Each structure stands twice: as C-alpha cells, then as structure tokens.
Ligand binder design. Structure first.
Ligand SMILES: *[C@@H]1O[C@H](CO)[C@@H](O[C@@H]2O[C@H](CO)[C@@H](O[C@@H]3O[C@H](CO[C@H]4O[C@H](CO)[C@@H](O)[C@H](O)[C@@H]4O)[C@@H](O)[C@H](O[C@H]4O[C@H](CO)[C@@H](O)[C@H](O)[C@@H]4O)[C@@H]3O)[C@H](O)[C@H]2NC(C)=O)[C@H](O)[C@H]1NC(C)=O
Ligand code: NA
Ligand code: NA
Lengths: 87, 155, 302
C-alpha cells in the first residue's frame, strides 16, 4: 500500500480518536478509557517516525499496515464501551 | 401551518442532539475526492427551495415540503445498518433519541405522511461521522425556518 | 510544461541533487520562419537559432525569461518557472505551515456571516520578489463562480527573531444563497511565485464551517444600587446576517479578571454579579450550528 494511503489512514485515525477524546469530556472507568486513548495517540506518534524515515528491527510497510488495523480494532472497542456507557 | 412555535421548539432540540449525540471530527477531516458524487445522492435544502425568508413570506409550504422530505431521508439513514450494524448503536442510545426526534418533527409537519451501506465496522464508523455532520447542516436550516416563521408568520 | 498565464509557463521537476530535469521545447510566438535567435534574461549570448529552442531545465539557472529576436527586434518572451517536487511532495517553502487545525494548513479562511463573502489569510517570511494570485469556485468538477480581490499585506510582526508577513484576500460568491444548505464546498486556490519558484496551495470548506461572528455590539452594564448585581445588555453585530429572526445568535456571558463564571443565553441581556477589577465579557455564536465563537466584547465592572 502507498505511503500516501497509509498517511491518509493515520490522519483518519488521529481525527477519530481526537473526536472520541472530546466526546468523553462532554460526559466502566472514564479515567482508564482516557488513558487508553492517550496511549493510542502516543503510538501514532511513534509510528509516524517510522513512516517519515522512508531478531529485532524497525517496521516494514506491511507491519505498519498491520499495526494500523490493530489500532482501529482498539478504537472500535473503546467506541463500543463509550456508546454503552451513554446508553 | 402548522404549530410554528411547536416546530421551533422541536427543531431547536434537534440541533442540540445532532451535535451532542455522537463524537465529532473536524470539518476538514475525513474528506476525500469522491465526496462530490456521494453528496449528490443526499437531499439538501438547496438554493431556490423556498426556505429563505422571502420565500417563507410568499408561501412557506414549498420549504416545509422540502424539510419534511429531508427529515424522512435522515430517519431512514439513522435507522439503517449504517447505525444498527457493527459497532451497533441501540434504539435507546443518543443517536436513537436523535432518530426519534426527527420522527417527532416530521409527524408534526405531516401527521399522515408516510415513512450505499458499508460492510466493514471501521467504514461504518467513518460514515457515521459523515452522515451526522450532514444532518447538522440540514437541521440548522430547518431550525432557522421555524424560528423565523414563529416570529413573523404566527397569527 | 504547462501554461500558467499568457507567456508564463511552469516546469514540474523531480528535485534532488544532480537531477537531470526535463527537456522542454520553446516555440517563438511569431509568424516569421527565418533569422530567429534566442537569449535568456539580461545576457546577450545567443542560446540558439530557429523557430524553436530546445533546453534542459534542471535548476533555477535554466528558468527565467527566454526571448526570441529577429532583426534586432524582440518577437516574443517566455517566462519559465519551476515547480519542485521533493520526494513526491510539491514544495511549500513560500508559506508558513500554521499547523492548525491540522498539519499542512497554509491558508486560513473566515466568514463574518452567510452572505457568500469570506476572507483568507496566510503567512510568509519572504519580503521581496513575491507574487500571489487567488482564484476560488464553489465545487471542483462543475465550478460555480466566486470573485476574489487581490491579496495584500495585512500585518507585519516579529516571530522567532525574524519578520513574519501576513497577507489577506477577500472573496465573494457570485450567486450566493445565504439561507440554503450548502452541498458543495468552496475551493480557494493560491498561486505563489518567489523569484522563479512556483508553488500553489488550496483550501476547501463550507461557509457555515468558517463562520465567526463579529463581537457583540454596544455592551453596557447597569449596576443595581446597594448590590454587586448588574444588568448586562448588548446588540447583534452590524455585519451579522439579517433578518436576525432567521439567522439567530446565542451568547456566552462571563465574569472574570481562577474559576469560570459563565452563563449562556439567546437573549441580548443577562443579570450577573460583578466584582472589582473584573470585567464582564460577552461573545457570540451561530445559535443552530457549532462554528467559531466571536472575539469577546468586554466592559469593566463597577
Ligand atoms: C498546482 O500545481 C500543480 C502541479 O504543478 C498543477 O497541476 C498541473 O496542472 C497543469 C494544468 O492543468 C497540468 O497540465 C495540463 O495537463 C493536461 C492533462 O495532461 C495529462 O494528460 C495528457 C494526455 O492527454 C498527458 O500527456 C500528460 O502528461 C498529463 O498526464 C493537458 O491537457 C494540458 O495540456 C494543455 O496544453 C496543450 C498544449 O501545450 C493543449 O493542446 C491542451 O489542449 C491543454 O490546453 C496541460 O499539460 C499538469 O499535468 C498538472 N500536473 C500534475 C502533476 O497533475 C495545478 O494545476 C496547480 N493548480 C492550479 C490551480 O493552477
Ligand atoms: Na512552508
Ligand atoms: Na452596585
């Protein structure tokens, strides 16, 4: 997958988690969920350095795509927790 | 034609819920090149639909028909698999309350009026942000129409 | 190579050290067929003869004004500018990244109302040899007319030990519908030329999303005798869309000089409790859609 596409996916993920973060302000542990959100944002920053650089090593493209998918699943789990809390 | 102050109250509530029911993104976020075609299939209160103050003074029925159509459209969208599918929102969720408020207003306008989809959960979620910010734009125009009618058209 | 405007051309280049660049063929815009020569900028060195000139464009020394002549008279001119692509990305040297609301935000636009008029701003460190050109439309595939004025200096300030120049431009949609629900965004397109370097920039938005009302007008305080209670009053700003019965505003009233003593109202008056050295401040937002709050209007307490 292109670097342009990967940066688009990262931008979307940054927008969604920023929005979830703001939504939590407007409202089973909130402090815990906010820490998980911040940790994802933190990992996005570390991943961005892997991108702008283009038994142990750094990340390939495929490995970046796999981590993005994993981050999306973590965001979906958080989103589902929050939606259940406000319902 | 019909209960201006009642429509004002309900359309104001719709604006509040459209913004509070669900997380938001920035207006420059989640934009893409194909959005021009996607926008075309959604109904809008367009130039010339009669919802400007002068058109409302002349004959508000044109505007209110367009508002009713848009409300019916967004009710169908908010009740579709985009919102009920994985990650699922329940009918009693804030988005479910927003859906019920669309229905309440459309019923007030025409009591006897009668009432595409992605498969991946991440894509459903993205589309929810896009649909709801479109809805925010629509219900803001509707709320101005009813506020102005209540202020200037109520005998 | 493509034509930016009459007799002005842009050559796109993959830009890296010792890059070979692009071969271009310039044609003298003339009926003549014999006795033609070419030069560049001020030098009289004849670079070539004939109706056409083939040149290798790979650095700024190859850009500039190419002139063809016959019989000592100038026949035509061709100005070549370079558009650098650095590692697959077009250069953005000329404008400063404002990094808000996101990375690569070079243009910022605001509207005071729904009239279809708006203003855009950008920042640069460059002081000389600098030209901007602004165009706008509503929609990209089927563009609807927007008329823009000239971009000109609006402020000069010092930031990080160097001058920062702010430019602004005013634009007006030709056939605006203040009350309608926009379905196609405004596009703003800015050409920037610094010497022989060409860049361009874009912003896309709905007017409703860049709304920022002017501050409340005529903010006044009426103190109550023997109390710190005060009646606050104000008016809608002159520039806001009319009629106000349609384009309603909402307001935030704050008393401050640590905490946040705020109330929200749709009226143009409120009752609050003042204290010394504190100010009463009021700001405004579109009642029905969450765009930007106005700047504060403020009056001191007492
Ligand atoms: C911001 O900056 C960018 C990057 O520099 C500009 O993008 C360039 O825009 C120009 C002008 O539109 C483009 O040049 C034009 O391209 C047209 C399409 O060319 C493609 O397709 C042909 C096949 O038909 C290919 O051969 C070609 O290589 C391209 O792949 C052409 O039709 C245009 O030709 C014009 O001139 C000839 C004679 O010279 C006429 O016969 C034609 O009828 C026509 O009038 C022209 O070449 C250029 O391709 C863009 N670059 C990229 C990378 O996309 C943006 O335009 C600029 N933004 C603004 C607002 O100016
Ligand atoms: Na820059
Ligand atoms: Na007093």
């Amino acid at each position: 997958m292109s670097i342009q596409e990967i940066q688009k996916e990262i931008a979307q993920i940054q927008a969604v988690i920023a929005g979830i973060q703001k939504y939590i302000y407007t409202m089973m542990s909130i402090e815990e969920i906010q820490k998980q959100i911040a940790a994802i944002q933190c990992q996005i920053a570390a991943i961005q350095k892997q991108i702008y650089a283009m038994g142990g090593s750094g990340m390939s493209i495929e490995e970046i795509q796999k981590q993005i998918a994993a981050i999306q699943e973590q965001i979906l789990a958080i989103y589902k927790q929050i939606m259940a809390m406000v319902t | 034609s019909p209960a201006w102050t009642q429509c004002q109250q309900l359309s104001q509530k719709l604006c509040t819920l459209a913004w509070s029911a669900h997380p938001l993104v920035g207006h420059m976020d989640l934009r893409e090149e194909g959005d021009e075609e996607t926008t075309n299939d959604v109904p809008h209160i367009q130039c010339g639909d009669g919802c400007d103050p002068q058109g409302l003074r002349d004959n508000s029925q044109f505007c209110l028909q367009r508002i009713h159509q848009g409300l019916i459209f967004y009710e169908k969208l908010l009740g579709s698999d985009i919102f009920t599918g994985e990650p699922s929102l329940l009918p009693d969720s804030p988005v479910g309350q927003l859906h019920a408020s669309l229905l309440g207003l459309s019923q007030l306008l025409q009591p006897e009026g009668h009432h595409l989809s992605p498969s991946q959960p991440w894509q459903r979620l993205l589309l929810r942000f896009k649909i709801l910010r479109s809805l925010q734009a629509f219900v803001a125009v509707a709320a101005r129409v009813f506020a102005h009618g209540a202020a200037t058209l109520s005998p | 190579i493509w034509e930016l405007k009459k007799d002005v051309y842009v050559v796109e280049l993959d830009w890296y050290p010792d890059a070979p660049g692009e071969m271009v063929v310039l044609t003298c815009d003339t009926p003549e067929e014999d006795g033609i020569t070419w030069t560049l900028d001020q030098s009289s060195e004849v670079l070539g003869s004939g109706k056409t000139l083939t040149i290798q464009v790979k650095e700024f020394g190859d850009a500039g004004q190419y002139t063809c002549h016959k019989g000592g008279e100038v026949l035509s001119h061709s100005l070549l500018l370079l558009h650098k692509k650095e590692d697959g990305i077009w250069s953005t040297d000329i404008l400063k990244d404002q990094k808000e609301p996101k990375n690569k935000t070079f243009l910022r636009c605001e509207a005071k109302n729904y009239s279809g008029r708006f203003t855009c701003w950008w920042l640069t460190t460059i002081s000389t040899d600098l030209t901007f050109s602004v165009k706008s439309s509503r929609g990209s595939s089927d563009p609807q007319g927007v008329t823009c004025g000239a971009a000109t200096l609006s402020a000069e300030r010092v930031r990080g030990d160097n001058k920062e120049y702010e430019y602004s431009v005013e634009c007006q949609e030709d056939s605006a519908c203040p009350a309608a629900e926009e379905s196609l965004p405004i596009e703003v397109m800015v050409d920037a030329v610094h010497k022989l370097k060409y860049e361009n920039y874009t912003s896309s938005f709905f007017i409703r999303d860049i709304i920022k009302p002017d501050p409340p007008k005529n903010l006044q305080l009426k103190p109550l005798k023997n109390s710190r209670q005060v009646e606050v009053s104000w008016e809608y700003p002159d520039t806001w869309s009319t009629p106000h019965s349609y384009f309603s505003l909402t307001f935030c009233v704050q008393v401050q000089g640590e905490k946040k003593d705020r109330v929200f109202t749709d009226k143009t008056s409120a009752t609050v409790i003042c204290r010394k050295n504190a100010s009463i401040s009021v700001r405004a937002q579109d009642r029905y859609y969450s765009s930007s709050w106005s700047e504060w209007a403020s009056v001191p307490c007492s």
